[PDB]
Design an enzyme around this catalytic site. Structure first.
Site, PDB file in Angstrom:
ATOM      1  N   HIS D  41      53.279  42.300  38.607  1.00 54.86           N
ATOM      2  CA  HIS D  41      51.958  42.289  39.169  1.00 54.86           C
ATOM      3  C   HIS D  41      51.885  42.394  40.644  1.00 54.86           C
ATOM      4  O   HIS D  41      52.531  41.344  41.265  1.00 54.86           O
ATOM      5  CB  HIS D  41      51.185  41.002  38.878  1.00 54.86           C
ATOM      6  CG  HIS D  41      49.895  40.678  39.441  1.00 54.86           C
ATOM      7  ND1 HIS D  41      48.601  41.518  39.175  1.00 54.86           N
ATOM      8  CD2 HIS D  41      49.658  39.889  40.472  1.00 54.86           C
ATOM      9  CE1 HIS D  41      47.822  40.959  39.932  1.00 54.86           C
ATOM     10  NE2 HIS D  41      48.186  40.205  40.636  1.00 54.86           N
ATOM     11  N   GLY D  42      51.407  43.502  41.193  1.00 54.69           N
ATOM     12  CA  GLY D  42      51.895  43.483  42.528  1.00 54.69           C
ATOM     13  C   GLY D  42      50.174  43.184  43.298  1.00 54.69           C
ATOM     14  O   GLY D  42      49.268  43.435  42.882  1.00 54.69           O
ATOM     15  N   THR D  43      50.368  42.233  44.208  1.00 54.32           N
ATOM     16  CA  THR D  43      49.308  41.760  45.011  1.00 54.32           C
ATOM     17  C   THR D  43      49.497  41.518  46.423  1.00 54.32           C
ATOM     18  O   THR D  43      50.542  41.676  46.888  1.00 54.32           O
ATOM     19  CB  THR D  43      48.566  40.634  44.209  1.00 54.32           C
ATOM     20  OG1 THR D  43      47.308  40.228  44.781  1.00 54.32           O
ATOM     21  CG2 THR D  43      49.436  39.400  44.236  1.00 54.32           C
ATOM     22  N   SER D  50      48.723  31.929  46.088  1.00 54.90           N
ATOM     23  CA  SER D  50      47.837  31.352  44.993  1.00 54.90           C
ATOM     24  C   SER D  50      48.460  31.165  43.620  1.00 54.90           C
ATOM     25  O   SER D  50      48.511  30.217  43.040  1.00 54.90           O
ATOM     26  CB  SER D  50      46.655  31.781  45.151  1.00 54.90           C
ATOM     27  OG  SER D  50      45.980  31.563  43.962  1.00 54.90           O
ATOM     28  N   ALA D  58      41.050  32.770  36.531  1.00 56.15           N
ATOM     29  CA  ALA D  58      39.844  33.807  36.722  1.00 56.15           C
ATOM     30  C   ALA D  58      38.898  34.185  37.370  1.00 56.15           C
ATOM     31  O   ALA D  58      38.634  35.361  37.623  1.00 56.15           O
ATOM     32  CB  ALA D  58      39.368  33.703  35.232  1.00 56.15           C
ATOM     33  N   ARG D  59      38.094  33.147  38.124  1.00 54.66           N
ATOM     34  CA  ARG D  59      36.929  33.682  39.088  1.00 54.66           C
ATOM     35  C   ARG D  59      35.951  33.317  38.341  1.00 54.66           C
ATOM     36  O   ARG D  59      35.450  33.775  37.137  1.00 54.66           O
ATOM     37  CB  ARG D  59      36.804  34.994  39.582  1.00 54.66           C
ATOM     38  CG  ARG D  59      37.300  35.549  40.963  1.00 54.66           C
ATOM     39  CD  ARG D  59      37.416  37.144  41.111  1.00 54.66           C
ATOM     40  NE  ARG D  59      35.735  37.305  41.240  1.00 54.66           N
ATOM     41  CZ  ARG D  59      35.439  38.230  40.238  1.00 54.66           C
ATOM     42  NH1 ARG D  59      35.979  38.862  39.439  1.00 54.66           N
ATOM     43  NH2 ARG D  59      34.181  38.443  40.194  1.00 54.66           N
ATOM     44  N   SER D  60      35.057  32.327  38.533  1.00 56.60           N
ATOM     45  CA  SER D  60      33.872  31.840  37.767  1.00 56.60           C
ATOM     46  C   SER D  60      32.691  32.790  37.854  1.00 56.60           C
ATOM     47  O   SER D  60      31.495  32.594  37.511  1.00 56.60           O
ATOM     48  CB  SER D  60      33.259  30.492  38.441  1.00 56.60           C
ATOM     49  OG  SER D  60      32.440  30.170  37.198  1.00 56.60           O
ATOM     50  N   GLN D  61      32.801  34.472  37.995  1.00 61.39           N
ATOM     51  CA  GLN D  61      31.979  35.175  38.329  1.00 61.39           C
ATOM     52  C   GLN D  61      32.251  36.395  37.301  1.00 61.39           C
ATOM     53  O   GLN D  61      33.333  36.772  36.906  1.00 61.39           O
ATOM     54  CB  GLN D  61      32.101  35.796  39.609  1.00 61.39           C
ATOM     55  CG  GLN D  61      30.638  36.702  39.976  1.00 61.39           C
ATOM     56  CD  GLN D  61      30.793  37.171  41.275  1.00 61.39           C
ATOM     57  OE1 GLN D  61      31.359  38.396  41.843  1.00 61.39           O
ATOM     58  NE2 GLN D  61      30.445  36.451  42.323  1.00 61.39           N
ATOM     59  N   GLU D 145      49.589  50.943  31.992  1.00 60.99           N
ATOM     60  CA  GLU D 145      49.340  49.738  32.833  1.00 60.99           C
ATOM     61  C   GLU D 145      48.761  48.831  31.614  1.00 60.99           C
ATOM     62  O   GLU D 145      48.054  49.313  30.837  1.00 60.99           O
ATOM     63  CB  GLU D 145      48.473  49.945  33.883  1.00 60.99           C
ATOM     64  CG  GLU D 145      47.130  50.854  33.310  1.00 60.99           C
ATOM     65  CD  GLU D 145      46.031  50.989  34.580  1.00 60.99           C
ATOM     66  OE1 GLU D 145      46.829  51.252  35.803  1.00 60.99           O
ATOM     67  OE2 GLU D 145      45.001  51.230  34.202  1.00 60.99           O
TER      68      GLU D 145
END
Ligand code: AMP
Ligand code: AMP
Ligand code: NCA
Ligand code: NCA
Ligand code: NCA
Ligand code: NCA
Lengths: 189, 204, 204, 189
Positions: D41-43, D50, D58-61, D145
């Protein structure tokens, strides 16, 4: 189950080393472990010896006899009816308080052909009794005698009674039944 | 005691004439009459056969061992030594029942019954010096961690033991219990009672 | 994770929208995907609500405690102190699931994790100094005799916890678990895995 | 999961205190606990920070976005396609070997409208992915992917890769991928 003290021994002379004292203690222990007194069982000396020190066992014979069971009686007057010509002993019979739901009562008299049908209805299975017990009248020394299916009979704890037998009276004398035991002996079913 | 029909027998290939359906009936009947299940017992074919049709007949720690976890009892469900004919083959698991009214004499400790202080701790709950009388004590097995229960002989001789529907594997003698091999319907009826961890307070 | 339909919520009167039928579905779905049940966890309404919809988020013995025996977890399924509003009311039991592949890091000891020698014994099985990482250790509870399991936080944060169908009694806060109150269908699906009592031998 | 040694720290300068040595040990530990490597996983730097020290979350959105998931790739060539203008980091993603039955593969390309229907057939439930993962072609730096449903994504153990990034090449140079890691990195699904 004998409590402590000496060696309980059945004798025509009387049950050696057994006091109402011992009785009250061994009764309280049984009550603390869930057992409840259901009546008396009168039999002869060496048979008492066997039951108390060896346990209640069935006899590998007559496996399908319809009314096979171990008989007991609420009043020792009736139980007293049993002992040897030569002097027996009385025993008190205990069962776990949980099996009481399987004790039935009928007015017909047991071990007679017309009771078979009714009794199977109560018991909910063809005879002979399994983990059931059935009480019906037909004593003489008093009415009411109880039959214990052998599977129940063999899982009862049995101990000597303090009511003694007399080699002159082979009925039962009221005065001979200790009043302390008179108290212990109330009945469930 | 064992329900409707055929004559049950212990075989290396399985218990003959026993099915979960029959076990459900036997169990209901025993419950209907005041019996509660407190564990499994594993042995060889011969001991199994006679206990089931002869009953449990009988030291500080003398008693009959049972186990709530079938996996632990399953480790004893085999010949531990070659027998007469030189065989070591699987055994059977039996289900042990006692009266509900007897439950007050069932205690529980975190000491292994081997632990030096086990004895007094056990006498303290039991309420009388050892051997166990109409009592029972459940604690961890030393060296394993699983709980093993010991019924006192007086209590044990007054049990009702019927066959389990959990089969032992003949193509795998000594094996561990595949959990999937327990019938859900047997799993479903095998919860255990809550034993006392504190001494006996007198009944009403 | 929680199956078909309605939105589940924790109430003193029961878990809203949860039924044994729903639990059977949720369970099958998790099994279908590699999850195995290893125990119950009991708490108060708020902790319950968030664990179930927020997950298990986090000393030598730091871990998350669970119990195979619902009776033990049921003793913690309540407020242990009055809360903000001065209440002490029942809680809920949750069922904890971990991947089958993680089972090799689940060990078992007969030492109470309090016992002076527990630590080295636990490090000996675990294979690394404490805290538990993706490991778990099941042993008897001190003072009780029942087995309590501690998952290491790394493992715990990676569980799947869903509601149990076993209700806690609001007319009896602090009470013991009536065994009859467990749905047979839940009892039926709650067998546990066999944990290792000997150290980890390396995989193939 | 880092093993031992110092403090792993992402820097444009390079991941501080991370050797293929450390890699092999932390890989062996994971393998001993049932985890299997599923891709890279590239970031970018603080996002790597993090994930590794805080966990995949996940992100609450956008809770119902059909193709919501955490993307990874078998070849770091493709993963390498991701990093900040200013230099990122590559991470290796582990899942318990038991969830592998829920990894599906399709030829259609993901996150395009015609794949929705097929993918739901494989996954056996309406999207978005739950404890599933779906691989399909559509990389560029290579095809293929993989998308991880967030419930799976958040229960993966993530660790730094030993393949480094270059502030000159922001594709991936073959020579830079340690051959020891080349070995560790075989694929299941
Ligand atoms: N150990 C025994 N268990 C039960 N009853 C026995 C035993 N020994 C003697 N008896 C007597 O045998 C009769 C019971 O045997 P049965 O003839 O099959 O009813 C009764 O009189 C019992 O008192
Ligand atoms: N802690 C996190 N967990 C997962 N992804 C994150 C996190 N922090 C940064 N990221 C990056 O955020 C993107 C995932 O967020 P989302 O935009 O919902 O896909 C990817 O680029 C991740 O590398
Ligand atoms: N043998 C006995 O004591 C007995 C008692 C009552 C009825 N039948 C037999
Ligand atoms: N035979 C058995 O099942 C057994 C169970 C527990 C302890 N010891 C023996
Ligand atoms: N909360 C719980 O269920 C629990 C179980 C076992 C030990 N400690 C806590
Ligand atoms: N962000 C990534 O590393 C990535 C890898 C593969 C496919 N899509 C995104």
């Amino acid at each position: 189950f004998l409590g402590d003290g000496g060696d309980v021994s059945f004798s025509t002379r009387g049950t050696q080393n057994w006091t109402v004292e011992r009785l009250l203690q061994a009764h309280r222990q049984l009550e603390e472990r869930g057992y409840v007194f259901v009546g008396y069982h009168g039999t002869f000396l060496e048979a008492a010896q066997s039951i108390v020190f060896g346990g209640v066992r069935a006899r590998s014979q007559d496996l399908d006899a319809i009314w096979r069971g171990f008989y007991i009686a609420g009043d020792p007057a009736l139980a007293y009816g049993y002992a040897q010509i030569r002097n027996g002993a009385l025993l008190r019979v205990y069962v776990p308080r949980s099996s009481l739901p399987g004790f039935y009562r009928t007015s017909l008299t047991l071990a007679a052909p017309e009771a078979a049908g009714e009794v199977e209805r109560l018991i909910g299975h063809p005879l002979p009794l399994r983990l059931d017990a059935i009480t019906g009248p037909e004593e003489e020394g008093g009415r009411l005698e109880t039959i214990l299916g052998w599977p129940l009979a063999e899982r009862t704890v049995v101990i000597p009674s303090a009511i003694p037998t007399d080699p002159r009276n082979v009925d039962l004398d009221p005065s001979s039944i200790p009043d302390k035991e008179q108290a212990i002996s109330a009945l469930p079913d």
